[PDB]
Ligand binder design. Structure first.
Ligand SMILES: [Zn+2]
Ligand SMILES: [Zn+2]
Lengths: 895, 89
DNA sequence: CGTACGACGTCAGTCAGTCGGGAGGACTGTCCTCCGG
């Protein structure tokens, strides 16, 4: 039997929504990947929901297919699920009727049965009271049973990369990115969205919503536009695959009706241009299938998968891959046809025939990858590229090395990372290769939780292959960022290989990270050795929220190591950057609002405006405490390092000062701090003296700091000048990487390391209290991973043979909840202590990536305000409602 | 005769010399002499070509749709509106 | 404590600069009459 090609859908934001067929109270499930202890990973708790046609005001039906709107450049949040009865239920996540919410909470838009608008936020089944809903099975394939669902993209363009080649002239890998113009059918901006569904009887549907209205509209037709309804209700289409073509507003509805035993072709046309779009249909061609092969063995059509081919490829005609299996023979033939117009001096031209040695039980086309996956019976997967149908896992062996471009690599699968012995399809409910092809998702009958299998490499003892492997995994992320994919699957696969390397030689594994991340900069045309102008662009760049997160996970096992610590402090400094400069721009505009709105004092709008002006500065005080607490830690390490320069465990101090933008970034923070204080002094609060406490406290905390900022300001300024003249003395680009990522100084520059120890003592410490800073309480900075997760789980739990992902059932009884995973003591965004009330209310969020815990995006209690009051004010924590500091997703913490 | 782009835009006497000129030179600006703009000939034969084709498209338009619609289109500047008009058939 | 002086801030007035209506006027092309072929 054919597997569940569309039972599960990995949303582009990481949400895994899959069909549920075992629970008697729910039919759909939601989950996602989260980190257990920074090393291992586990799936989140399943959030079960029940879907029935009568949610608008009772038996529910099974789910037929799940289609996340991750196609092209769509945001990927609006999930539309079609049940077995044919009703299309549309669920929007990440939004509420009154406010914005996280990505694990659902909401309805409209229900189809006639279509009507009814906004209602759904609730989980477990939390909901026991209802009188029973699992009625719609075992009948109705006329309205949707065969294939397809989404419609907008007019936006998508920029991706095609492949990379090894430039032997420079001994480095080079990649080229080509913009992909939209092809097929795209909906205009004034339409909120559009979608198309083909029903098993031939009736077509076209749901759309106007961006300026709430009412939904539906337009329906039928494929066989004959004068008789006798044949209208006869088109029982076995396969109905919709492949958009380069023709404008055209979709090739390749159908195979067993009534006429021919693979009929159709063309669908839509005129967008507020009038309703007009739908047109035009029959084109019909052909018969071949009965026999060349040698005399008969064939049976197992599947009809047509590839969604763009105009980039040489021949844009879609590949109609009609699969045939020679009976009683392990061989399986895949005949390829292409549709072309008939030329004078349409038709199907046969190119060639491809023989496979194992029977195929499932075909899935990858998105934005052009990869057809052949899920054979024995569990092995052979992904053939669309360009040449050459096996990706064996392309390197058979590649013609000689030429201008050598070692053409498109994915980490080209290196040789092959999946292990997957479970047999009979026991498997459904499979799906991960988006980056690094692993496969398997759902099992007797397993209540999804499994996971990663790629392995047999020749891990050969050291000469580390150069290729690091480059191959480097390009894997390059495509993911361009497609806005989380790429959490690729992160797990990279760590397992590194772990096996570190078991034999720990020194070798460290160099693997450095070479791997270096290729990312070359691929994206970003250079850490560039002039200072580009350096400003780097700090604001999104990738550092993810590329730095790579070493945050790839370096977790290395205890007492500064690879992850160096990335976290820079990453948290970015959060520190968003704090002051995020509000410095906001506070600047408040100055002008005072003068122009001074002509109406008694209005009820100015009083709330005045109150909000002095309330905002109050919330910065908890952040400033961690800001001062951070600079003291680095100054404390200066005194310790002088006595014992040979201590390798304290080498993190070198990298922090070595970073070039960090010295400028702190100077900019000190600059705006001076500007804010000067502006506050220039423009103080005079109407209400009681509100001056927050403004006055800002001046006091700077003056009362144990170390003067002006003395510390000159400290980093002098380092920049000395580190620039050294570049002119000898040209080197690895030192830029060393001062930013390695947090070390190369042995060839051992003389440079001695300068940091000697000069730092006389520069700033001479104006501060030496005895006080050494004994100062700077603990609790939440810098190391050891003080993020609880000590019970901060260790390896399973052997590397069993894999890196851990099922929840194997966790300790007291450690089987997300509440016991981390230290729930301090906040991570506003850097404020968490009281018992904020802990117990269940309104705080946890990051599935770095383990951070934050109550951002929620109304703060009255005790945290300037004056206890019931007035609700939307504070700056609302920026991180859905995205964490490390670009991870934030979810409501379970109680 | 031709004044430089900037003097035109500003409406002050242009020195008009070659290459630049007094105020673009002095004031420090890139002085240009743009081509005359192509416009339709204002002859009587041409106004009549155009009035008489507009009239005949109006006459044909009225065999297809009501006069009240004539008057709407004759004023529309938006291409969506000209098309929607037609879509309400 | 009270008065006087100085300094700062605010308001008004004047000057300059710039967008703009449009005058000046060479010119394009109209649109008459009626020559002379
Ligand atoms: Zn001029
Ligand atoms: Zn000029």
């Amino acid at each position: 039997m054919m597997l569940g090609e569309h039972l599960m859908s990995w949303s582009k934001t990481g949400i895994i929504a899959y069909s549920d067929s075992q629970s008697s109270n729910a039919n759909i499930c939601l989950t996602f990947l989260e980190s257990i202890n920074g090393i291992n990973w586990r799936f989140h708790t399943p959030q079960k929901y029940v879907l029935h046609p009568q949610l608008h005001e009772q038996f529910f039906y099974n789910i037929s297919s799940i289609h996340w709107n991750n196609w092209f450049s769509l945001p990927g949040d609006m999930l539309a699920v079609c049940d077995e009865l044919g009703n299309m239920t549309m669920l929007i996540t990440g939004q509420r009727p009154d406010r914005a919410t996280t990505y694990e909470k659902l909401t309805m838009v409209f229900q189809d049965n006639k279509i009507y608008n009814h906004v209602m936020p759904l609730k989980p089944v477990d939390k909901l009271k026991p209802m009188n809903i029973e699992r009625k099975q719609t075992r009948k394939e109705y006329n309205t049973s949707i065969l294939e669902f397809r989404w419609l993209t907008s007019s936006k363009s998508v920029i991706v990369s095609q492949f990379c080649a090894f430039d032997s002239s420079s001994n480095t890998y080079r990649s080229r990115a080509q913009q992909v113009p939209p092809y097929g059918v795209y909906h205009p901006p004034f339409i909120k969205y559009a979608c198309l569904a083909i029903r098993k009887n031939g009736q077509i549907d076209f749901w759309y919503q106007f961006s300026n209205s709430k009412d939904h509209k539906k337009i329906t037709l039928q494929l066989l536009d004959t004068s008789n309804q006798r044949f209208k209700d006869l088109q029982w289409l076995e396969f109905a695959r919709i492949t958009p073509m380069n023709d404008d507003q055209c979709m090739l509805i390749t159908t195979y009706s067993k009534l006429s035993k021919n693979i009929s072709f159709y063309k669908l046309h839509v005129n967008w241009n507020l009038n309703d779009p007009s739908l047109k249909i035009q029959f084109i061609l019909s052909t018969t299938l071949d009965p026999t092969d060349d040698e005399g063995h008969v064939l049976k059509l197992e599947n009809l998968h047509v590839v969604s081919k763009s105009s980039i490829e040489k021949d844009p005609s879609p590949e109609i891959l009609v699969l045939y299996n020679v009976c009683d023979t392990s061989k399986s033939l895949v005949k390829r046809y292409r549709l072309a117009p008939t030329q004078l001096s349409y038709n199907l031209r046969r190119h060639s025939d491809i023989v496979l040695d194992k029977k195929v039980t499932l075909i899935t086309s990858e998105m934005f990858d052009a990869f057809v996956s052949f899920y054979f019976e024995d569990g092995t997967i052979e992904s053939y590229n669309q360009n040449d149908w050459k096996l990706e896992t064996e392309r390197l062996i058979s590649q013609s090395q000689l030429g201008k471009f050598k070692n053409i690599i498109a994915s980490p699968l080209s290196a040789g990372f092959n999946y292990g012995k997957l479970p047999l399809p009979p026991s498997v409910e459904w499979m799906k290769v991960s988006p980056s092809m690094c692993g496969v998702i398997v759902k099992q009958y007797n397993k209540k939780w999804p499994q996971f299998y990663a790629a392995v490499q047999k020749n891990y003892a050969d050291p000469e292959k580390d150069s290729i492997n690091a480059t191959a995994l480097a390009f894997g992320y390059v495509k993911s960022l361009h497609k806005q994919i989380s790429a959490e699957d690729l992160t797990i696969a990279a760590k397992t290989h590194i772990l096996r390397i570190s078991f034999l030689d720990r020194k070798r594994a460290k160099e693997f990270i450095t070479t791997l991340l270096k290729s990312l900069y070359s691929f994206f045309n970003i250079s850490p050795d560039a002039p200072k102008e580009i350096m400003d662009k780097i700090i604001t760049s999104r990738p550092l929220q993810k590329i730095m997160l790579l070493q945050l996970e790839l370096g977790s096992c290395f205890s007492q190591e500064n690879i992850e610590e160096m990335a976290r402090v820079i990453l948290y400094l970015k959060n520190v950057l968003f704090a002051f400069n995020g509000v410095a721009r906001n506070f600047h505009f408040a100055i002008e609002q005072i003068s122009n709105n001074s002509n109406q004092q008694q209005n009820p709008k100015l009083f709330q405006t005045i109150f909000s002006k002095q309330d905002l500065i109050h919330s910065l005080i908890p952040v400033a405490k961690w800001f001062v607490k951070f600079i003291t830690y680095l100054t404390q390490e200066i005194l310790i390092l002088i006595n014992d320069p040979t201590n390798k465990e304290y080498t993190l101090v070198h990298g922090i000062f070595g970073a070039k933008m960090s010295r400028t970034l702190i100077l900019s923070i000190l600059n705006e701090i001076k500007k804010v204080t000067q502006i506050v002094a220039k423009f103080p609060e005079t109407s209400y003296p009681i509100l001056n406490e927050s403004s006055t406290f800002l001046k006091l905390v700077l003056s009362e700091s144990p170390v003067d900022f002006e003395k510390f300001e000159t400290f980093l300024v002098d380092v920049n000048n000395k580190f620039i003249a050294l570049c002119e003395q000898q040209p080197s680009q690895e030192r830029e990487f060393s001062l930013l990522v390695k947090a070390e100084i190369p042995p060839e520059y051992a003389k440079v390391g001695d300068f940091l120890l000697q000069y730092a003592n006389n520069a700033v410490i001479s104006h501060a209290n030496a005895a006080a800073v050494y004994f100062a309480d700077t603990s609790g900075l939440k810098i190391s991973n050891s003080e993020f997760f609880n000590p019970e789980i901060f260790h390896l739990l399973q052997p590397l043979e069993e894999g890196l992902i851990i099922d929840t059932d194997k966790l300790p009884i007291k450690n089987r909840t997300s509440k016991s995973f981390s230290k729930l003591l301090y906040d991570d965004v506003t850097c404020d202590k968490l009281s018992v009330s904020e802990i117990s209310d269940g309104k705080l969020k946890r990051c599935s990536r770095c383990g951070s815990v934050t109550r951002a995006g929620n109304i703060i209690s009255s005790d945290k305000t300037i004056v206890p009051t019931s007035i609700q004010t939307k504070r700056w924590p609302t920026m991180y409602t859905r995205l964490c500091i490390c670009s991870g997703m934030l979810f409501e913490m379970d109680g | 005769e031709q004044a430089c782009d900037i003097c035109r835009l500003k409406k002050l006497k242009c020195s008009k010399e070659k290459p630049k000129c007094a105020k673009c030179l002095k004031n420090n600006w890139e002085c240009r002499y743009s081509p005359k703009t192509k416009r339709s000939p204002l002859t009587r034969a041409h106004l009549t070509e155009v009035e008489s084709r507009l009239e005949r498209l109006e006459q044909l338009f009225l065999l297809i749709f009501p006069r009240e619609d004539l008057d709407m289109i004759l004023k529309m500047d938006s291409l969506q509106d000209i098309k929607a008009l037609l879509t309400g058939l």
